[PDB]
Amino acid sequence: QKTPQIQVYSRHPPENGKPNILNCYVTQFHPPHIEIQMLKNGKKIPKVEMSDMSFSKDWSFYILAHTEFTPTETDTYACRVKHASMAEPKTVYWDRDM
Amino acid sequence: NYTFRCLQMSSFANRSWSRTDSVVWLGDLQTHRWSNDSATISFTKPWSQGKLSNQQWEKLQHMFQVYRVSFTRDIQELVKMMSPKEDYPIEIQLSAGCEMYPASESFLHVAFQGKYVVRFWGTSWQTVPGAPSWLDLPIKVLNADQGTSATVQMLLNDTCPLFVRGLLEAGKSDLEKQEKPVAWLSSVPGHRQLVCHVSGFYPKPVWVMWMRGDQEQQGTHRGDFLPNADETWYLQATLDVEAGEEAGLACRVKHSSLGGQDIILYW
Numbered sequence: 001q002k003t004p005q006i007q008v009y010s011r012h013p014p015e016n017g018k019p020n021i022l023n024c025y026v027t028q029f030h031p032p033h034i035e036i037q038m039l040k041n042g043k044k045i046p047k048v049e050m051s052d053m054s055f056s057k058d059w060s061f062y063i064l065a066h067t068e069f070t071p072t073e074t075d076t077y078a079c080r081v082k083h084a085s086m087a088e089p090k091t092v093y094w095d096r097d098m
Numbered sequence: 099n100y101t102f103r104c105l106q107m108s109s110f111a112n113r114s115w116s117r118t119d120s121v122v123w124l125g126d127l128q129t130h131r132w133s134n135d136s137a138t139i140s141f142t143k144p145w146s147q148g149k150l151s152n153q154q155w156e157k158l159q160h161m162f163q164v165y166r167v168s169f170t171r172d173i174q175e176l177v178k179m180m181s182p183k184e185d186y187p188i189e190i191q192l193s194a195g196c197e198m199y200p201a202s203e204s205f206l207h208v209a210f211q212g213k214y215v216v217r218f219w220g221t222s223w224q225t226v227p228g229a230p231s232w233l234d235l236p237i238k239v240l241n242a243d244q245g246t247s248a249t250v251q252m253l254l255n256d257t258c259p260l261f262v263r264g265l266l267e268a269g270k271s272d273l274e275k276q277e278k279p280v281a282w283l284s285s286v287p288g289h290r291q292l293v294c295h296v297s298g299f300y301p302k303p304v305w306v307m308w309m310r311g312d313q314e315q316q317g318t319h320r321g322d323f324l325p326n327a328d329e330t331w332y333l334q335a336t337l338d339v340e341a342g343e344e345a346g347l348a349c350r351v352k353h354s355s356l357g358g359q360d361i362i363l364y365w
């Protein structure tokens with residue numbers, strides 16, 4: 001079993017009040033069954049688009065989640081991943097620069 | 099150098115549950131999706147059919163339709179025969195296709211529980227050094243199936259290069275698309291850490307460097323290439339610096355799409 005690495009980054013320069021796209025890229029996991037949510041202020045965002053799961057040269061799986069977002073200085077955004085390799089869900093908050 | 103990969107993922111959960119899903123990639127652009135849910139192979143591009151006629155495509159599709167059911171039956175049946183020694187859950191991955199050259203080489207690799215165990219090479223299937231010894235007998239059996247060996251050899255040696263040359267022609271404008279990067283700077287709010295962000299570029303080759311005037315700052319750490327959802331790439335390059343030394347620094351970007359007019363962001 002392999003633990004998912006999680007990276008969160010924005011499609012365009014994050015400018016407050018401008019609509020944008022936030023990406024959550026989950027990598028290096030096995031087995032492929034996995035549950036990925038993106039969060040605004042700690043709540044599940046409803047419309048989260050997902051790429052088809054694929055895998056790398058080393059056979060580890062990867063997948064890209066993405067959703068529309070508008071950054072402001074009153075909002076946090078995160079990506080929570082549940083997977084058999086980890087006891088509890090792992091969450092990565094958006095760096096705010098990325 | 100374009101590498102065509104068909105990536106098959108099979109999960110077997112217990113005896114009454116399994117799914118097989120596939121995705122196909124020409125280089126870094128996804129060309130096909132084949133969900134367990136669907137009887138047919140779906141296109142993720144307008145040119146996903148290559149130069150194959152509607153009939154020629156259906157014949158190839160049928161062959162893979164037959165394969166998927168047969169493969170599932172065979173793995174289910176192997177597990178019953180080996181029980182309780184080999185038992186659920188089981189994950190099988192196949193990576194198969196061909197790497198084109200100015201000429202091509204083909205491959206078919208199989209992983210079991212995340213480890214590479216089996217390949218097709220030449221005229222036969224074979225386990226690889228260090229594979230579990232219980233795979234040797236099932237692979238010998240499979241190697242007796244002459245017709246399967248012959249179809250696999252056709253598929254690897256001939257069909258794959260022929261079909262990909264069809265994709266390279268049919269999807270030329272899409273494969274040779276130029277998308278421009280946008281960049282922006284940030285830092286961790288002791289020595290600071292400057293981050294130059296570069297998103298939206300295609301194709302993959304790119305150059306990102308921190309600069310002071312014309313001097314490349316060789317402490318520049320290049321991050322991994324992260325995909326965007328719109329078939330463009332994301333990359334960041336960071337530099338660890340002392341405070342007060344950030345004046346006069348800049349991030350310089352070069353990319354094919356920019357036509358020699360580099361991006362320069364002064365800190």
Ligand SMILES: *[C@@H]1O[C@H](CO[C@@H]2O[C@@H](C)[C@@H](O)[C@@H](O)[C@@H]2O)[C@@H](O[C@@H]2O[C@H](CO)[C@@H](O[C@@H]3O[C@H](CO[C@H]4O[C@H](CO)[C@@H](O)[C@H](O)[C@@H]4O)[C@@H](O)[C@H](O[C@H]4O[C@H](CO)[C@@H](O)[C@H](O)[C@@H]4O)[C@@H]3O)[C@H](O)[C@H]2NC(C)=O)[C@H](O)[C@H]1NC(C)=O
Pocket residue numbers: 202203204205206218219220221251252254255
């Ligand atoms: C498809 O292409 C195959 C080769 O390409 C590789 O595999 C495919 C799947 C791709 O992944 C591609 O990227 C790879 O490069 C091709 O396989 C070849 O088929 C012939 C038989 O038709 C084999 O020839 C036999 O060779 C053996 C010796 O093999 C050993 O030694 C050589 C080194 O000299 C190594 O290359 C091998 O790895 C082995 O270690 C001979 O013993 C044998 O000679 C005897 O039998 C023949 C009858 O066939 C008589 O004429 C002779 O006089 C002898 O009595 C063969 O000559 C060849 O080994 C095999 N290549 C490999 C690498 O295994 C396959 O045939 C293609 N099929 C089609 C339908 O196109």
Ligand SMILES: CCCCCCCCCNC(=O)CCC[C@@H](O)[C@@H](O)[C@H](CO[C@H]1O[C@H](CO)[C@H](O)[C@H](O)[C@H]1O)NC(=O)CCCCCCC
Pocket residue numbers: 161164165168169172190194208209210216233240243244245246249250
């Ligand atoms: C536990 C981890 C083990 C992983 C290692 C084992 C991997 C085994 C992989 N096996 C296969 O890919 C083949 C499975 C299907 C095959 O065994 C046959 O059942 C199937 C049907 O064969 C019969 O009909 C064919 C005509 O349809 C031929 O005439 C054949 O002679 C006859 O026996 N074979 C196929 O579907 C062959 C074509 C698909 C091959 C594609 C491989 C990616």
Ligand SMILES: *[C@@H]1O[C@H](CO)[C@@H](O[C@@H]2O[C@H](CO)[C@@H](O)[C@H](O)[C@H]2NC(C)=O)[C@H](O)[C@H]1NC(C)=O
Pocket residue numbers: 115116117118134135167
């Ligand atoms: C994956 O896809 C195949 C589609 O063929 C499913 O296989 C069928 O499974 C159902 C069980 O609900 C049976 O009624 C059929 O006999 C099966 N069909 C064939 C052709 O074998 C399979 O169930 C799917 N798996 C999941 C998890 O959805």
Ligand SMILES: CCCCCCCCCCCCCCCC(=O)O
Pocket residue numbers: 104105106120121122130132139158162192194195253254257258261
């Ligand atoms: C196995 C080598 C394939 C060579 C032929 C390539 C052109 C046909 C593309 C078929 C894509 C179907 C995806 C299923 C992949 C699989 O299950 O192995």
Ligand SMILES: *[C@@H]1O[C@H](CO)[C@@H](O)[C@H](O)[C@H]1NC(C)=O
Pocket residue numbers: 111112113114115
């Ligand atoms: C088989 O596996 C599925 C998915 O893991 C599970 O939900 C189901 O309960 C299992 N069925 C049986 C009959 O054991």
